[PDB]
């Protein structure tokens, strides 16, 4: 399948070269997979989600996304126009308040929630969790991410936006999950992207168009935007049967575009997520 005039990041993940604008992908499109977006919530009523998104958990007075961040990330995972895996099921877990903030205890609870809640959902092709959040190093936060991964969920986490080594941030620094840095449309490391040996992969993160609250759209930047590209890619590849939750990060690294990004610090992988779709 081909989506013309796609957001640049979708085109990038199906291309061996920057500078194109059509997204190519197998029509299965992540059908039968599930992606949890652990964030500020999801505006599930947005026409872009087509009834495939729902809130399953909140730790606050509402499950609604009063911020937009979680809706944007969910849109990059699986919205019809802005999403990588256009037929996946999206589940929202609101661990961040409408200012985008959350306590680590709540974030940990949300990860353990997903590890159990997947057993209440129909995801025959597999389960992914997208965590566009983080803060300073916490062994307890890393352990929660490791549990979620161990339970059979492909965990993708943002590297962080400090232009610093991600070893000092959580859950970015957890070795067993997929830590995602950000790139721009010219294949440069995004100016804010964290780096370091703990990164597994880069995805599009600068000037990413996606869904927003109020039934709208907007373009924003962050490793928060790169992470759902990788989460959606994992769901798509799992639906194709090419990989599993336990192996998808490694598979994405195996099949990435290699050596094509600029300003990658020595010691950080030079790997850009790629769906290897041959039309």
| Residue-range domain boundaries for the chain | 2-272
| Packed helices 69-78 and 223-239: angle between N→C axes, nearest 10 degrees | 30
Domain 2-272 has CATH 3.40.190.10: no
Instruction: Assess whether the previous peptide bond of 165 is cis (omega < 30° from 0).
Output: no
| Torsion on CA atoms 92, 93, 98, 102, rounded to nearest 10 | -150
Neighbours of 63 (CB within 10 A): 17
Query: C-alpha 236: how far from its chain's center?
Result: 12
Nominal resolution (angstroms): 1.0
Strands 126-131 and 271-272, by their bridges, are unpaired
Binding site per annotation, positions for Ca(2+): 16, 175, 177, 200, 260
Q: Which technique?
A: X-ray
Binding site per annotation, positions: 16, 175, 177, 200, 260
Active site amino acids:
39, 69, 224
């Amino acid at each position: 399948a081909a989506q013309t005039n796609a957001p640049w990041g979708l085109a990038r993940i199906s291309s061996t070269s920057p500078g194109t604008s059509t997204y190519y992908y197998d029509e299965s499109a992540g059908q039968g997979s599930c992606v949890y977006v652990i964030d500020t919530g999801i505006e599930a009523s947005h026409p872009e989600f087509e009834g495939r998104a729902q809130m399953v958990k909140t730790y606050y007075y509402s499950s609604r996304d009063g911020n937009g961040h979680g809706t944007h990330c969910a849109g990059t995972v699986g919205s019809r126009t802005y999403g990588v895996a256009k037929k996946t099921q999206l589940f929202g877990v609101k661990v961040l308040d409408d200012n985008g903030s959350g306590q680590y205890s709540t974030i940990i609870a949300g990860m353990d929630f997903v590890a159990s809640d997947k057993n209440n959902r129909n995801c025959p092709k597999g389960v992914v969790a997208s965590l566009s959040l983080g803060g300073g190093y916490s062994s307890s936060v890393n352990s929660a991410a490791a549990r979620l991964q161990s339970s059979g969920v492909m965990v993708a986490v943002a590297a962080g936006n400090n232009n610093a080594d991600a070893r000092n941030y959580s859950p970015a620094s957890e070795p067993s999950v997929c830590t995602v840095g950000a790139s721009d449309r010219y294949d440069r490391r995004s100016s804010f992207s964290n780096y370091g040996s703990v990164l597994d992969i880069f995805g599009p993160g600068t000037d990413i168009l996606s869904t927003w609250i109020g039934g709208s759209t907007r373009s924003i930047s962050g490793t928060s935007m790169a992470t759902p590209h990788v989460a959606g890619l994992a769901a798509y590849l799992m639906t194709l049967g090419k990989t599993t939750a336990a192996s998808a990060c490694r598979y994405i690294a195996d099949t990435a575009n290699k050596g094509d990004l600029s300003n990658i610090p020595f010691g950080t992988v030079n790997l850009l997520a790629y769906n290897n779709y041959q039309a």
